[PDB]
């Protein structure tokens, strides 16, 4: 379930562009005289690939976003020009171009009449170079300059990096690589062609270790489930029957609950998954296992107590005190107020004079992780006592020093009964000291392998741990050493590396969009669905559980953070050339200029005679999408039905209309009563005049020699003009290289004989014999 | 007359001060109570504390309303403590507060209006009913209409 | 409303939530405005 969900995230895809990415293309036009005659030749203007610019600024501008999310998506990874490779038969040296449409283009102007011989030789030398000692090739290519500058982008800013055996050794974490007990081998030389991605493993930025508990308990979860899933078995333990035997002849019945290999396990494992993802753990135990009271005084002893819950951990130590040391020393019960300031065992050290005893209390009350950055990672790391299993001696003293007590004020069954509890664990004194070591190393091992901060932060849930499972540990604990295996570290470190590449990956994509839909000013769209869309994709969470209010949150810690530098580059691409996008599309136009006062038709070679404006110059502007927000047309009504001359200003559709006779009638002046009547602009829609030899009216302007006239004008660009020789860009990237992922994949790594394990201090984990 | 809202919860930036005292009581150490019903206390005033934005969001919606429907107020917003209250509930404002979403709901001008005209009607009936009233009234004091 | 008592629940942690519901937003939205209007 949970471990399914967190070991499915499979590490990220490279993309290899197939394509050449392109916003516009070469379309063949009739051009007229200035007259307005046919040329009797045409030609080649740059278009949009795809006019579906709609109408308004803001969907503009939505438009615009979604073009930038376009591009990210197909925003390549690694490039290889070979792939995308042509021959262009026009070619004299029978080279090759560098896209199909390159190659489409190339085909079209050298297959022409029209074309001039100048192109024509252009065409036959444009050729590849390759360049095989540096590895790299260059390729002829024909891209409007915006789609050459997102191309060069592309190429110049891939994500590959060189590969070779001493980056693939450097992969693992330097603790394991500096650990004697685990053996490392390869059996393969990659070349020097050999490329890999790194993956992004900068530390959580949007702390969901602080105010986000629900959250930050799913995450905790998910690492405690890996953890247990990685933390290994305990093998030869002592037998259940034989320990329970001895044990009865210990106590002479006439403390054995819970005991058992399984509860013994599952201790272990609890504890060291507990610990690794920071998960917290309530105690669950009964008052009246006095045995179960004396692991928990070992367990208190081991794990330092900011691990557990307040009230759990108080509780265990209410009832260690008040039936073994107070007991012991003849000390009236503690009366222990619920909510003290204060634990039973900060109390107890300071009313309990046996040196021993006030000692390791002190030191349990005064334990803690030490919070180390190891590797550019946060660590909760041990006492160095704990690692090496020193403070089992504290404990035992201790316990001797109880056990010597008279016990006073108490029957002398009460007495002989704890005293036996303890012979129970004196018994186990040195398999306690290699337990406690063995634990120790098994969470140092297993914590080089986290490359996520160690957060320590109380989590809304706990994970239940039981005193007999405890218990059972230290009663069933045996001489065998049980090392992680070194598949099973890196599995565990590639599952965290996936888990943390993903997370700064679906970081930087919301950052991104939020990002960009701020710099477009949408102002009327909710980010919602974004983090929606980014707590889906970490997968993990349950979006449909997550209320709103979280998702805003996020979205506001989100909002602070920087945008990755690849991302960021192209959004400033996109945000430059917006103006030449938005200006070359042939369904909208960009206002409407009312001037009440005749202005001659412009003369362009693509039109003819045209009422195209190139500028809003000298003329008052009035904002459409401000105006259809607002919805208040008092200004636009007065100066509609005053002749004011103004210029409406907006992404507006035109009708092109190419009738002599309509330009005669002036039909572009009256298409703006129906704002003052309807009072809305979203159906405005003015009239582009298109006069020219087609127009089936042009005997009017060929023989009274008039320059038409309109009263009103479209403001609009002319569209660009289309230079192959201009246009041809070489393309460079690297001739070839192979790409891998899962770089552990050619690590062969193997352990030490588990008896010969050697712990941080150089002497064996376990040695009991 | 009317009764008027100060400006700062007219535009919802007390909601922020109050989020700062929820806060500071969140990290409070709160002094010998159970630890467990502390951390319960203290999440839950984070509950309140993490919905600063959709609080003031509420806030000024609901100032937002009240200032538009009163402008369709005729008589006086005299203020009294009256016999019998409206019983409010907590548990509803609870709900208010964690349930308020996103989306701005004023009234329609036809809801304004009809508002408006019915605060008219009921104020011309009672000044017109008073005019009758008196004028009856004073014409049987001044006829003598003892009985 | 699912999704913010289960929240409140598990933020709770109660080893309270009656009573908060849509109808039950409204219905204090609705009292307040109203009884600011009328000074009851």
Known sequence: ??????????????????KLFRIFEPRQKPIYIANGEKER?????????????????????????????????????????????????????????????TASICDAIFQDEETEGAVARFIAEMRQRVQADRNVVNYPSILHPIDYAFNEYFLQHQLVEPLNNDIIFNYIPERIRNDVNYILNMDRNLPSTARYIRPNLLQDRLNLHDNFESLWDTITTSNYILARSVVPDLKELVSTEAQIQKMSQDLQLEFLTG?????????????????????????????????????????????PNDMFIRESLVACQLAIVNT??????????????????????????????????????????????????????????????????????????????????????????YKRSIQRGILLLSNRLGQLVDLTRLLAYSYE???????????????????????????????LIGNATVIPSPQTLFHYYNVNVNFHSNYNERINDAVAIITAANRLNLYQKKMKAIVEDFLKRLHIFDVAVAPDDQMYRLRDRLRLLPVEVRRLDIFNLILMAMDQIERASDKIAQGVIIAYRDMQLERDEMYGYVNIARNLDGFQQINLEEL???????????????????????????????????????????????????RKV??????????????????????????????????????????????????????????????????????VEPINAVAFDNMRIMNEL
């Open 1 to 18: 379930s949970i471990l399914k969900k967190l070991e499915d995230i499979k590490p990220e895809q490279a993309k290899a562009q197939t």
């Open 41 to 101: 030749r045409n030609r080649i203007y740059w278009k949009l690939k795809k006019d579906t610019l709609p109408d308004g600024d803001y969907d503009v501008r939505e438009y615009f976003l979604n073009l930038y999310d376009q591009v990210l998506t197909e925003m390549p990874d690694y490039l290889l020009l070979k792939d995308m490779a042509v021959e262009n038969k026009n070619s004299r040296d029978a080279g090759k171009v560098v896209d199909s449409e």
């Open 259 to 303: 005991i058992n290999s399984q509860a013994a396990n599952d201790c272990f494992k609890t504890l060291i998954a507990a610990m690794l993802s920071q998960r917290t753990m309530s105690l669950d135990f009964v008052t009246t296992n006095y045995m179960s009271l004396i692991s928990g005084m070992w367990l208190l002893t081991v794990v």
């Open 324 to 413: 073994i040391i107070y007991v012991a020393f003849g000390m009236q019960r503690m009366h222990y107020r619920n909510g003290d300031p204060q634990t039973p065992f900060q109390i107890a050290e300071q009313q309990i004079q046996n040196f021993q005893v006030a000692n390791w209390l002190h030191f349990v009350n005064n334990n803690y992780f030490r919070q180390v950055v190891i590797d550019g990672v946060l660590n909760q790391v041990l006492n160095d006592n704990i690692r090496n299993g020193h403070v089992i001696n504290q404990l035992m003293e201790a316990l001797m020093q109880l056990s010597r007590q008279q016990f006073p004020t108490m029957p002398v069954d």
């Open 445 to 475: 091992t297993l914590m080089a392998c986290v490359t996520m901060n160690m957060q320590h932060v109380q989590t809304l849930t706990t994970e239940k741990l039981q005193l007999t499972s405890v218990t059972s540990l230290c009663m």
């Open 628 to 678: 259809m927000r607002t919805g208040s047309y008092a200004q636009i009504t007065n100066m509609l039905l005053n002749n004011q001359p103004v210029a409406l200003v907006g992404a507006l559709p035109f009708v092109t209309d190419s009738s002599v006779i309509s330009l005669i009638a002036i039909l572009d002046a009256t298409v703006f009563a129906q704002i003052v009547k309807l």
């Open 682 to 751: 979203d159906t405005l829609k003015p009239i582009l005049y298109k006069i020219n030899s087609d127009s089936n009216d042009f005997y009017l302007v060929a023989n009274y020699d008039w320059v038409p006239i309109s009263t009103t004008k479209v403001y609009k660009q002319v569209p660009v003009q289309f230079d192959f020789r201009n246009s041809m860009h070489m393309l460079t990237s690297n001739l070839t290289f192979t790409v891998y992922s899962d770089l552990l994949a050619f690590v062969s790594a193997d352990t």
